[PDB]
């Protein structure tokens, strides 16, 4: 009675509007897509009376599935509305990233674990229990629900592309169990290679060219000297974000009992995920040893 806990599934913010959060939980970096993950129905479980007054388990699990399908269905529609109803790679990737995060929430292997997410975790603890075999029971429940949730996320494209529908987003890929940190490095990298050309483009309009072929515009010119300070802000953040994500990866990779074909370091994930990735170019970029920062920002 006004005591009802509720987290609304609001419109998705413009891509890269809010950067990766490396401050909230300092061991990890959270993407704004994850913070905005639709959890309306999962969160609502805190308010459900002890309907245990006349129920058991198999039922609880089924209730959970129906509620999770609804949150996944909303997420799918809102993500499509974010990509401006364009049924492309960008959308498929988000469906993969978000499907993945629902799985980690259920498995109790998610890295947000704060506020409403701590509330969703406690809700799942109430359904499944807290014994040693509770986490596997959860993992099992996920392995029997994971494809239904992906088909639930795709409902929006299906309903909107009636019969004029193709499988641009493949099941086998989206429903593939991978560690959270691996999936987020894939998402971060993708965001990075988008931010980067823009960031070099603004640094160029103010700094490319010499004061009669001899002297850099970054030496005596303030509009440029400024562009360098602001590009430095961005590259400083991405470097921090990278080192944080990289460390988490190292920790997780060791704990993991499952071998990932080809994945040895975080660099291997980007080389896998991104088209034409070069780790020497990346390493130089994040460490201000790139052609652009030297040629446009140092005297």
């Amino acid at each position, epitope marked *: 009675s006004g005591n009802t806990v509720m987290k609304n599934c609001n419109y998705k913010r413009k891509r890269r509007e809010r950067d990766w959060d490396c401050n909230t939980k300092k061991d990890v970096c959270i993407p704004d897509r994850r913070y905005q993950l639709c959890m309306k129905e999962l969160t609502n479980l805190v308010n459900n009376t002890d309907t245990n007054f006349h129920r058991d388990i198999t039922f609880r699990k089924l209730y959970l599935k129906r509620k999770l399908i609804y949150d996944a269905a909303v997420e799918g529609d809102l993500l499509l509305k974010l990509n401006n109803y364009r049924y492309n790679k960008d959308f498929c990737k988000d469906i993969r990233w978000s499907l993945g995060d629902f799985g980690d929430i259920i498995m109790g292997t998610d890295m947000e674990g704060i506020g409403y997410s701590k509330v969703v975790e406690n809700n799942l603890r109430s359904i499944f229990g807290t014994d040693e075999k509770a986490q596997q029971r959860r993992k099992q429940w996920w392995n029997e629900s994971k494809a239904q949730i992906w088909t639930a996320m795709m409902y929006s494209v299906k309903k909107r592309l009636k019969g004029n529908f193709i499988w641009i987003c493949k099941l086998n890929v989206a429903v593939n169990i991978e560690p959270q940190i691996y999936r987020w490095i894939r998402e971060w990298g993708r965001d990075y290679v988008s931010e980067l*050309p823009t960031e*070099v483009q603004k640094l*160029k309009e103010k700094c*490319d060219g010499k004061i009669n072929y001899t002297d850099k515009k970054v030496c005596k010119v303030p509009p440029c000297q400024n562009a360098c300070k602001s590009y430095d802000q961005w590259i400083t953040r991405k470097k921090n974000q990278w080192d944080v994500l990289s460390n988490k990866f190292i920790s997780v990779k060791n704990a993991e009992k499952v071998q990932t074909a080809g994945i*040895v*370091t975080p*660099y*291997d994930i980007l*080389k896998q995920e991104l088209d*034409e990735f*070069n*780790e*020497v*170019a990346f*390493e*130089n*970029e994040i460490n201000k*040893r*790139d*052609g*652009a920062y*030297i*040629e446009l920002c140092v005297c």
Partner: antibody, heavy 118, light 108 residues
Framework: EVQLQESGPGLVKPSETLSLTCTVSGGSVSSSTYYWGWVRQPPGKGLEWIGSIYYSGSTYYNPSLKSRVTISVDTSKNQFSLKLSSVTAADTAVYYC??????????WGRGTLVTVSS | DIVMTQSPSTLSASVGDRVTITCRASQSISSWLAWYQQRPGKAPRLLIYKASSLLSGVPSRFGGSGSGTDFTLTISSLQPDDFATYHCQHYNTYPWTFGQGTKVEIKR
């Protein structure tokens, strides 16, 4: 799949100018992050860095050759070139073009042998 | 100008053997060292950058160690296609300079 290929005569008479060009395929030479360079390997000798260029035009040379070396960039043709003047038999070597990652040469060309002879 | 000194100039090991090459710098390089593999009839390839980072794609047997003046390339288990000449290179400051190279030969 970025790839590098050198082209140019394999025979130069002494005192004449040595020209070679590298041509970038599978990507652009207009890289905002990489430099493009030349490396030499004289017979029975170690590797020597000749110089590198950024697509903007900014050039870096080895004092060892700075006297008679010039490296150009044709962003239009997706190429970069080497010109080493007044050659001697000390300039007979295998010439490689490489992608210069501010010191880490992460992609090389196959190399071309230039023999200085009359 | 900095001077790079590789030791030995040549070495012979058997397949499966642990082999180590060293690169000694004249001045101190802050671990700005690159290691290249030149196999016969092949262009040099980058194996290791920043003294110890193993480039993605190159075999797991290659390991780089060191900082300052003394560096080591280590091949944990020699293979027939490891018959090549290995070159070290600094990138601390212009000009970039290479060591003379170490020829690795396979006992059979």
């Amino acid at each position: 799949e970025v790839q590098l290929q050198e082209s140019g005569p394999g025979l130069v008479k002494p005192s004449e100018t040595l020209s070679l060009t590298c041509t970038v395929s599978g990507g652009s030479v207009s890289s905002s992050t990489y430099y493009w360079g030349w490396v030499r390997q004289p017979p029975g000798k170690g590797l020597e860095w000749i110089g590198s260029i950024y697509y903007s035009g900014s050039t870096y040379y080895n004092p060892s050759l700075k006297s008679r070396v010039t490296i150009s960039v044709d962003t239009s043709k997706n190429q970069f070139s080497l010109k080493l003047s007044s050659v001697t038999a000390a300039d007979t070597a295998v010439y490689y073009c490489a992608r210069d990652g501010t010191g880490a040469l992460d992609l090389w060309g196959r190399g071309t042998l230039v023999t200085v002879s009359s | 100008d900095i001077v790079m000194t590789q030791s030995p100039s040549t070495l012979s090991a058997s397949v499966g053997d642990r082999v180590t090459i060293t690169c000694r710098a004249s001045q101190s390089i802050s671990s700005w060292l690159a290691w290249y593999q030149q196999r016969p009839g092949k262009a040099p390839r980058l194996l290791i950058y920043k003294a110890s980072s193993l480039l993605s794609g190159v075999p797991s047997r290659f390991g780089g160690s060191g900082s300052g003046t003394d560096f080591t390339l280590t091949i944990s288990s020699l293979q027939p296609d490891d018959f090549a000449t290995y070159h070290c290179q600094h990138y601390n400051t212009y000009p970039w300079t290479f060591g003379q190279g170490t020829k690795v030969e396979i006992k059979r």
